[PDB]
Amino acid sequence: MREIVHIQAGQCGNQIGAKFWEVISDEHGIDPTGSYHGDSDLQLERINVYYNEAAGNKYVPRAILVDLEPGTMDSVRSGPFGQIFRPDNFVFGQSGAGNNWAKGHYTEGAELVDSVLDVVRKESESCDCLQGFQLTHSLGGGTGSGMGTLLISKIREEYPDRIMNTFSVVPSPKVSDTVVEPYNATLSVHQLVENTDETYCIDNEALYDICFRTLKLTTPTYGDLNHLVSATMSGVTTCLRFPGQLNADLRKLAVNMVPFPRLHFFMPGFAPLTSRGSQQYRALTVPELTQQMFDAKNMMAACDPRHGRYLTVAAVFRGRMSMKEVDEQMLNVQNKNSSYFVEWIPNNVKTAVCDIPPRGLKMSATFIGNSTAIQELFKRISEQFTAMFRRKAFLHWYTGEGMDEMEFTEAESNMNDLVSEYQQYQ
Amino acid sequence: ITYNMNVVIRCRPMSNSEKNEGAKNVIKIMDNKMIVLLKEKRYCFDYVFDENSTQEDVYNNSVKPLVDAVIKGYNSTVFAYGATGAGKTHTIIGYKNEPGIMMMILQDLFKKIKTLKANEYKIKCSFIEIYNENICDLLNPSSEYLDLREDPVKGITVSNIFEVCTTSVEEIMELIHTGNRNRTSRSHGVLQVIVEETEKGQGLYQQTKKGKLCVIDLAGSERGMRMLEGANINRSLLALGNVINALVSRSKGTSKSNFIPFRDSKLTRLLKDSLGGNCKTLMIANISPSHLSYEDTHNTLKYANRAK
Ligand SMILES: Nc1nc2c(ncn2[C@@H]2O[C@H](COP(=O)(O)CP(=O)(O)OP(=O)(O)O)[C@@H](O)[C@H]2O)c(=O)[nH]1
Ligand SMILES: Nc1nc2c(ncn2[C@@H]2O[C@H](COP(=O)(O)OP(=O)(O)OP(=O)(O)O)[C@@H](O)[C@H]2O)c(=O)[nH]1
Ligand SMILES: Nc1ncnc2c1ncn2[C@@H]1O[C@H](COP(=O)(O)OP(=O)(O)NP(=O)(O)O)[C@@H](O)[C@H]1O
Ligand SMILES: [Mg+2]
Ligand SMILES: [Mg+2]
Ligand SMILES: [Mg+2]
DSSP states (O other), rough: EEEEEEEEEEEHHHHHHHHHHHHHHTTBBTTTTTTOOSSSSSHHHHHHGGGGETTTEEEEEEEEEEEEEHHHHHHHHSTTTGGGGGGGEEESSSSEEEEEIIIIIIIIIHHHHHHHHHHHHHHHHHHSSSEEEEEEEEEESHHHHHHHHHHHHHHHHOOOOOEEEEEEOOSSSSOOSSSSHHHHHHHHHHHHHHHHSSEEEEEEHHOOOOOIIOOSSOOHHHHHHHHHHHHHHHHHHHHHHSEEOOOOHHHHHHHOOOTTTTOOEEEEEEOOOOOGGGGSSSOOHHHHHHHHSGGGGBBBSSSSSGGGGGGEEEEEESSSSOHHHHHHHHHHHHTTGGGGGTSEEESSSEEEEEOOTTOSSSSSEEEEEEEEGGGGHHHHHHHHHHHHTTTTTTHHHHTTTTHHHEEEHHHHHHHHHHHHHHHHOO | OOOEEEEEEEOOOHHHHHHHHHBBBBBBETTTEEEEOOOOEEEEEEEEOOOOHHHHHIIIIIIHHHHHHHHOOEEEEEEEOOTTSSHHHHHTTTTTTOOOHHHHHHHHHHHHHHHTTTOOOOOOOEEEEEEEEEESSSSSGGGEEEOOOSSSSSSSETTOOOOEESSSSSHHHHHHHHHHHHHOOOOOOEEEEEEEEESSTTTOOOEEEEEEEEEOOOOOOOEEEEEEEEHHHHHHHHHHHHHHHHHHHHHHHHOOOSSSOOOOOOHHHHHHHHHTEEEEEEEEEOOOOBGGHHHHHHHHHHHHHHOO
């Protein structure tokens, strides 16, 4: 009961997905072969949420891997946990998208997409009560942005009543990796606005800051960064996988955190986060976790929560904890930091608690905030788009893939409207 | 700034079923501008039509000024309004042998057009069904469902919609009835026409006008396919209706200076051009006199006081 379907689209998305799978298999006591070697019966009770049971006491991720390039697939198959994935669930093209949203959405990814659709239909037919979909990808490239957008459009067309969740890698301001990133982000964000029910805005710059400042990590690799994201992902759906004292799944979270249809862009966070040295000089207690989570410098989106207000915040706690203590701490934070919370939604905080902690830790926390500061992310992007579009820079490539200028105009308008709406509700 | 949305109430006649139940007259009209719901909660409007009001009376005392504004170069929109069973399709389309304001409008509109034509007119009729946020072309159903597209200077065009440049009442009347035969109410019956006029002196600068007249058979509030339709329908009914409340704040000219939520639905986004335009608007609430409908008459009217 309550099966989730996982989709990974483009290189970054795939990489994050791999990490996610690795963590979750470890959590549920699943080895690199698909066999359960755990101790606790609780690890297998709700195994069906993320895994299909294959013949001979093995488990396989309900995961679809998508890319316009084959190399990524190979890399995944050769990596840790590569062999756990169903071979028929790898759907790859041969060409690539060349950082072009149009290639991914209209041309190459369109040719690709039917196969993917066929796979995912089958995957849906298998599960008895599919609750919905989780897509991991980035809005800065071509394959990852276009393919994902087309697929989510198709899944909202065929599954309009199911929950649609995305974990995106938003383009940061300073660390600009590509030149057409503004275009790709703009086009994809628009589509996300209409077709996702909740969107977790993850930002590389913020991750780097976390790694450098909070973990004090000498050399971050993408894997390390990805780990953080994976942890966050695991946090959200802990209530579907384990028992607890107060239980909240994907739907319950959405209903409590989304007051208006369009405002479904979250700034996620995780706690605790310490170095090796600073591990000894700390208190493993709920007050400390709470303190950590609400800090601006612990957000995985490059936005200052102190530049806006929290519309709603959901906190998900894992480990053996006193409910009273949890409640006290959340009330204290809202009373003390009154100015950071919208005053016309009393009790801006939703709490959920799962008894089963993550491995290595006795207590852990996951944060989901709907903050009006997310407007900053959109605004910058809009500005950059304007700067490009005013001089029609790089437009020709997109137009060569069948795209028309008017779409760009529309998307930009839409994003502007969204920004305005956030501002006004602040 | 304001949309000048007049609000009139039309009380449909008590049905034989309501009479057989023995329901009494929950609606008591106090004045042409005021009704009470029976005890006697007050509701206030620009005009109230009783159970015997004709299709011609509805036209003359509620939409004639909107139709006129359109022939004169303005936009205008009629939103029939209420719960399911309210009385909207009958008021708007009716039946071919017992037509709604659609016909009363075409007859008045075309007499004015034929007179003024002495300015060439192109009466660009269109008719769409908004169903699960998709837009059915009801005049050319071979195109199935269409999307909404912002335009240079961001008004909205239904992508690739078929329009007919009519010249008479009968052409639009037959066009529309056919369009209703092509419908699913499970949808918002958005009927609209562009009353376009170009200086008969075509060799002169053609400073044209494009008046817009629109009347909607809004899907009513409903309390797996039908559950979804209900859901989508009720959600859009709350979205457009609360975009109306935002328009009221705007129209009031109060401190709530923001962007109205027209983007919350395809219904509203398309209606946007007339909702906040150089226009006159009208809501025609449709209610029942029966005690049996009190929940319906109570909620439909509550909204109407807020819209007004
Ligand atoms: N947080 C992470 N970000 C990544 C990772 N790999 C890439 N990226 C970021 O994503 C962007 C590059 O995206 P992709 O390689 O996924 C583009 P994709 O392969 O989806 O389509 P193509 O345009 O066909 O290459 C850029 O901002 C990178 O800095 C990762 O492992 N973690
Ligand atoms: N006294 C007490 N209250 C509880 C307990 N568990 C949850 N609550 C309270 O119950 C309310 C939340 O409702 P739940 O019972 O968890 O929700 P539910 O009935 O399962 O409804 P859904 O999960 O929304 O389907 C809150 O006021 C909690 O504080 C408990 O063990 N004891
Ligand atoms: N003024 C009226 N006089 C006679 N019959 C009426 C009148 N108003 C409504 N009806 C009848 O009631 C039935 C119509 O409901 P209408 O079709 O009026 O409901 P509606 O508002 O379009 N319902 P809905 O589509 O669910 O929002 C029709 O067959 C009409 O003939
Ligand atoms: Mg790639
Ligand atoms: Mg419950
Ligand atoms: Mg109807």
